[PDB]
Design a protein around this nucleic acid. Structure first.
Ligand code: NA
Ligand code: NA
Length: 325
DNA sequence: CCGACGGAGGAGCAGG
DNA sequence: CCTGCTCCTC
DNA sequence: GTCGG
């Protein structure tokens, strides 16, 4: 199970409410931040005062923990769950393309279920229809061995379009995770820099649709594709679940800052650019830049690999498998 | 107290 | 044609 | 909702 999972489930459920119903994004991250640090906490919380010591748990969450520990539930949560409007709004946001704004409008005009969504196709946009059509699959995890094939098809199909493309599958997968939520692909080409072939991403997408790897399109422009993919059925067995795949085209001079940022983790990203500051550097997802007598960032530094970023700030290179914080 | 909390590409709209 | 807005995504 | 300044 998990030492404190009853508490972290309570917080995560509260986070979804603030995000989906209240439209309080910062409260959503507050509950998420508290849920994270408590999931890492290697003891089993016996009081709200104990949890309040941790960074991210404050007065209000400590009192809710005192109540959950004493009675086994949270009344704020109990009243929210039996409120039919709040929870229907919550549920509809699980459809890709339906955020908190669209979810409330739907529930306002009597639309509360997937069945209601299917009876009202006229009121959905293209993204929302694809999210509805694949509602079940998109909530399924991707086992690592399925990522490996998907990765193999992607890089192989990419190389066939041009040997000069470079593609890196990032996310938790690159750190060696047993499963992935989606597939996130970072693409670049030497002919695309910041001081700068006009269909570089389209040609790679075209090829993936042609071998019927990419099945649908959620959004697509010159630098960012968000769509749907599916592995080919072995022909002995049942077909695979449709999966989400994003493909970003990044200038070559910003590629490995991107690969590093979208590899993560978000904690490691936080710590890495923390260290960078103590050494006189600033890193975002695009560049690493020097500071800066008064604190002004200078011109981007040349980066040919991930290790160049580690070397500038004088950090020992760390494998993606060792970058979970 | 009191402001910050990641933030930009693309879809879909308004409007110049 | 263009910019600029919310919304959604990650 | 929480934190740091
Ligand atoms: Na605290
Ligand atoms: Na959604």
């Amino acid at each position: 199970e998990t030492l404190n999972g009853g508490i972290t489930d309570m917080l995560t459920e509260l986070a979804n409410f603030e995000k989906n119903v209240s439209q309080a994004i910062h409260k959503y991250n507050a509950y998420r931040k508290a849920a994270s640090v408590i999931a890492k906490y290697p003891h089993k919380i016996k009081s709200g005062a104990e949890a309040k010591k941790l960074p991210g748990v404050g007065t209000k969450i400590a009192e809710k923990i005192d109540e959950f520990l004493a009675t086994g539930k949270l009344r704020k949560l109990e009243k929210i769950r039996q409120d039919d409007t709040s929870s229907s709004i919550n549920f509809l946001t699980r459809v890709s393309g339906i955020g908190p704004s669209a979810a409330r409008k739907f529930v306002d005009e009597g639309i509360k279920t997937l069945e209601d969504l299917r009876k009202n196709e006229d009121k959905l946009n293209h993204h929302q229809r694809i999210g509805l059509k694949y509602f079940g699959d998109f909530e399924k995890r991707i086992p690592r061995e399925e990522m490996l094939q998907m990765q193999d098809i992607v890089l192989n199909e990419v190389k066939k379009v041009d040997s000069e493309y470079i593609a890196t599958v990032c996310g938790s997968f690159r750190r060696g995770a047993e499963s992935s939520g989606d597939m996130d692909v970072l693409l670049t080409h030497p002919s695309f820099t910041s001081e700068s072939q006009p269909k570089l991403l389209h040609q790679v997408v075209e090829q993936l649709q042609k071998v019927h790897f990419i099945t649908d399109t959620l959004s697509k422009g010159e630098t960012k594709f968000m769509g749907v993919c599916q592995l080919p059925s072995k022909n002995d067995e049942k077909e695979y679940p449709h999966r989400r795949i994003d493909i970003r085209l990044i200038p070559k001079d910003q590629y490995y800052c991107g690969v590093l940022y979208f590899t993560g983790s978000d904690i490691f990203n936080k710590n890495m650019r923390a260290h960078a500051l103590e050494k006189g550097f600033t890193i975002n997802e695009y560049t690493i830049r020097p500071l800066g007598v008064t604190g002004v960032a200078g011109e981007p530094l040349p980066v040919d690999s991930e290790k160049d970023i580690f070397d500038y700030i004088q950090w020992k290179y760390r494998e993606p498998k060792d970058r979970s914080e």
